[PDB]
Every structure is written in C-alpha cells, then in structure tokens.
Amino acid sequence: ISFFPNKPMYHVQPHISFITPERTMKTIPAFSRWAFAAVAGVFVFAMQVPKVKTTILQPIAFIGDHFKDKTPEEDKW
Amino acid sequence: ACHSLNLIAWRHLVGVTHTADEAKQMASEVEYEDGPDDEGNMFKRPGKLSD
C-alpha cells in the first residue's frame, strides 16, 4: 500500500519523466517573466508601425504628445 | 528659358519654398500632354501637382 513501509511519509506522484507537479509549480514564475520579457521586446521593436501608433500609443496620455504628426496645413500634396 | 531642371516635381516644393495651394496654382498655368483618349488622339491638359 505504501512505497516505503517503514516511513509512510513518502508518496509517489503522477509524472511523465520528471514533469512532476512540484517542479512545474516552481517553474511557473520563470515562464511568466520570460513571456513578459518577450512581450516587452516585441512591443519595443514595433513602436513605429503606423497602425500601432494610431491605435495604442497616441491614446496614452503624457507620452501621446511625442508620437504624433506635427506638420501644419502645408502637408502631403 | 534655356536650361532644364527635369528632375524636380511640383510636389517637391510644397513645404520647402511653397505651400500646397500656391504650388497647385502655379502648376495649373503650364500645359502638358495627357495620353490617348477614346479614338486615340493626343490632347493637352492643365498642369497638376505631380508633374
């Protein structure tokens, strides 16, 4: 009934090879941080695409001033 | 009258030495050829802002 009869405080747990639940519970913050870093990098590399500027960047206050078009009435033909 | 500058368009001047309305009005004076029409033929048209 028990893996170690002399010490019942030892239970085996479901696993595949070493993907036991405790290891994943320890791992989760690393995945969260890596995903956040990847998202930040992707956002950094696409901060000048016109669609991104006109959808996300400008509605943000304070910083929204910088990411505009300042050309007066003298503009595209 | 004698030299030619056939690499500077009218739209190259808006924002540098003229505005859009001034450039358009200045370019409307000159005349250009504008391709075939209906039964062939070669007609003339007033200038535009991309010539």
Side-chain angles (χ1 to χ4, degrees), chain A:
Chain A
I1 173 62
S2 64
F3 200 63
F4 177 80
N6 292 34
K7 282 209 176 283
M9 82 205 49
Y10 279 93
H11 299 154
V12 82
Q13 43 188 283
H15 51 67
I16 291 318
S17 174
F18 52 91
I19 290 328
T20 207
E22 171 146 49
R23 185 176 179 83
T24 86
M25 272 190 232
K26 257 147 201 62
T27 278
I28 271 284
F31 280 162
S32 69
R33 270 180 261 128
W34 270 125
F36 172 57
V39 152
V42 152
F43 177 80
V44 152
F45 269 98
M47 90 181 107
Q48 303 241 41
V49 161
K51 189 78 155 298
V52 162
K53 277 153 55 173
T54 185
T55 278
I56 318 187
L57 295 174
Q58 282 155 110
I60 281 178
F62 303 72
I63 308 307
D65 176 334
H66 175 234
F67 284 102
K68 308 203 68 50
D69 202 351
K70 319 294 194 40
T71 76
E73 61 76 10
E74 61 77 10
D75 213 8
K76 150 142 173 45
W77 51 96

